């Protein structure tokens, strides 16, 4: 097959191609080779495909109607590497998730149910369910509205998303090492998975402030080398095997908030600096803020009460994470606002 | 306000952008620009809410229509959509995006396939110049598959040879709008030249680089970029380009001796980002400058002898050759260059 139907969408602060599962090769080696060609990878410019030469604009959602009881659609996230011939399936992606609901409704996978449509989305990569609510005025998806998210110009229709049962969905526990803190290459880190495996550490401990812009961080070869050494050192401890060629864990460098939020973060995902912050990445970081003795807890400003709005500051503003904690202080849910937009709909081609 | 249009996303040469039928876009320029900005996701350094790839070279538009001009198959207007300003500019040719125009026009039925290699004569509306491209149409259908390669694009595709005649002065009114082979601007000798793309040609070494740096190093060189932009703003009137402050011309061309067997090595700012490779008509202008005695380009170039000259223009990821025919007076009378293209996505683009 040399082409496939495809909707190009912005999902949250990321961008990529949304496919029906049936339209892609069933064999995953052939599927991944096709997706590389669709995107134009490997190429630092992605000039001969639809990737935008940024991992955050080189992403794929494979969506299908679900047979799981109570679930509307199944969603597989695939990261297409920009300049390697690698497609990875080892993580969730809550930004690209934002486009899944609207894509599924437009494609008839799930019926609109009034002016707003709840969509229960099984995230195949980790086996957990997320719930998105999509504006469907008059029974049709809209992308217009009054909502805004930092990192995206303008305003769009809101897409509230809610995540439960996130802890340990990749590493088998919230803290796969069993410790709140671990010393790695002479630095305290928290190894944490509440929907995204993360290594959380103080920006100041790897020799930056945590307030640098994306270009400054991407050009900092010395910083990138130092944190890559830590990432490779903890891959097995987080039950992720050999992470050398994986996209996980995400490296989260935290600092005290500056614009009135809970914490400030710079993320490497795992090699490129994030332009903003990942959705489940932010949930893991926000969760670490609540763990006494974590580097995150030391720099964070944490509100009182069972339902905590934790503003996570990032290079171009912030993204707020509403957590509720149970009896024992465990996070039992996380809710975040996203938006999406259909950008182009048609057929993608490969040679 | 228009909220969708049919659109083919293509790679044209080493560039990428949206190809539209003229009839599918707003007739009013202001409405058209607001639509195209929104299609691309501009202004936004990351172009996250549209189809632009956060680089001027992947934020380009071609507007194509069947031509009524005798002997011309299609009319093609090139539009640059700025990445992080609300500006769409029509002031230049674009010979990379031109490569997609032939195949696009045949797919869209604007020109019929003719044999297995279809000639397509293309009127470049921005300057009134014509290019002639040949498109592989085996069995009557465009193919993008083939054995040709161009530096800056992985793999191989169908060849699209292109030939340009009557190139000189199409934006500035003359090949050398100042009348001089060299002018001194901000302390350094430059050549102001237009052989299809208005350019300021200067020695890389005179502005503090070697000319062999990679694109990332050049885009990070704020001191260099400020020096170059001050020169650009100082030459707009001399080049008969009026007020260039919000324009994308002239292109700033920094030349050095060839290092990999070519005629000259170039780095180009277009005008603000460093080029990842080199523009097609920009290269023609630089190649032409190499032939002018006294030019900075002639001082660093290695120029082959003969009436037919293959001038290899070296750039950050290899080279692109310009085959120039020159007449007895030494004037360039045609330029021929190989490009390729590929259809990437076809369908409908949307805006709010
Ligand atoms: O870290 C990455 O790979 C990029 C992401 C991840 C994300 O959204 C999430 O953590 O849920 C993104 O911003 O798209
Ligand atoms: O200079 C620019 O703005 C970019 C160009 C120009 C081009 O191709 C040409 O000079 O004909 C490109 O697409 O490479
Ligand atoms: Cl399906
Ligand atoms: Cl719909
Ligand atoms: Cl038309």
From Swiss-Prot, chain A:
Biological pathway: Secondary metabolite metabolism; lignin degradation
Disulfide bond positions: none
Catalytic activity, reaction form: (1E)-4-oxobut-1-ene-1,2,4-tricarboxylate = (3Z)-2-oxo-4-carboxy-3-hexenedioate
Function: Contributes to the degradation of lignin at the level of the protocatechuate 4,5-cleavage pathway. Catalyzes the isomerization of the double bond between C4 and C5 in (4E)-oxalomesaconate (OMA) to (3Z)-2-keto-4-carboxy-3-hexenedioate (KCH), where the double bond has migrated between C3 and C4 via a 1,3-allylic isomerization.
Biological processes per GO annotation: lignin catabolic process
Provenance organism: Novosphingobium sp. (strain KA1) (Sphingomonas sp. (strain KA1))
The entry's keywords: Aromatic hydrocarbons catabolism, Isomerase, Plasmid
InterPro entries from the UniProt entry: OMA_tautomer-like, PrpF-like
Family listed: Belongs to the PrpF family.
Name the record gives this protein: (4E)-oxalomesaconate Delta-isomerase
Gene Ontology molecular function, alphabetical: isomerase activity
Group of enzyme by EC: isomerase
EC number assigned by the record: 5.3.3.-
Encoding gene per record: ligU
Lineage of the species this protein comes from: Bacteria, Pseudomonadati, Pseudomonadota, Alphaproteobacteria, Sphingomonadales
Annotated PANTHER family: ACONITATE ISOMERASE-RELATED, ISOMERASE YBHH-RELATED
């Amino acid at each position: 097959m040399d082409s496939a139907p495809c909707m190009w969408m912005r999902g949250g602060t990321s961008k990529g191609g949304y496919f029906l599962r049936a339209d892609l090769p069933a064999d995953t080696a052939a599927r991944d080779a096709f997706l590389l060609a669709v995107m134009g990878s490997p190429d630092p410019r992605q000039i001969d495909g639809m990737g935008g030469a940024d991992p955050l604009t080189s992403m794929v959602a494979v969506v299908s109607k679900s047979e799981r009881p109570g679930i509307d659609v199944d969603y597989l996230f695939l990261q297409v590497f920009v300049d390697q011939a690698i497609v990875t399936d080892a993580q969730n992606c809550g930004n690209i998730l934002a486009g899944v609901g609207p894509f599924a409704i437009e494609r008839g996978l799930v019926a609109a149910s009034g002016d707003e449509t709840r969509v229960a989305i099984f995230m195949e990569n980790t086996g957990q369910v997320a719930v998105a609510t999509v504006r469907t005025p008059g029974g049709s998806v809209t992308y217009a509205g009054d909502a805004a998210i930092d990192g995206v110009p303008g305003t769009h229709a809101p897409i509230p998303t809610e995540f439960r049962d996130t802890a340990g969905s990749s590493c088998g526990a919230l803290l796969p090492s069993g410790n709140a803190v671990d010393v790695v290459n002479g630095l305290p880190v928290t190894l944490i998975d509440n929907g995204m495996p993360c290594v959380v550490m103080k920006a100041a401990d790897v020799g930056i402030t945590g307030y640098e812009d994306r270009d400054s961080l991407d050009a900092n070869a010395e910083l990138k080398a130092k944190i890559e050494a830590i990432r490779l050192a903890v891959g097995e401890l987080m039950n992720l095997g050999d992470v050398t060629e994986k996209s996980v864990p995400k490296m989260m460098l935290v600092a005290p908030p500056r614009d009135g939020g809970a914490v400030c973060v710079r993320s490497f995902i795992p090699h490129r600096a994030h332009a903003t912050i990942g959705v489940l990445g932010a949930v893991s970081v926000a969760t670490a803020c609540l763990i006494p003795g974590s580097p995150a807890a030391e720099v964070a400003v944490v509100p009182e009460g069972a339902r905590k709005t934790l503003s996570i500051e990032h290079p171009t503003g912030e993204m707020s994470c509403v957590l509720e904690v149970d009896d024992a202080g465990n996070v039992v849910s996380a809710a975040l606002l996203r938006t999406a937009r259909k950008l182009m709909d048609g057929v993608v081609f490969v040679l």
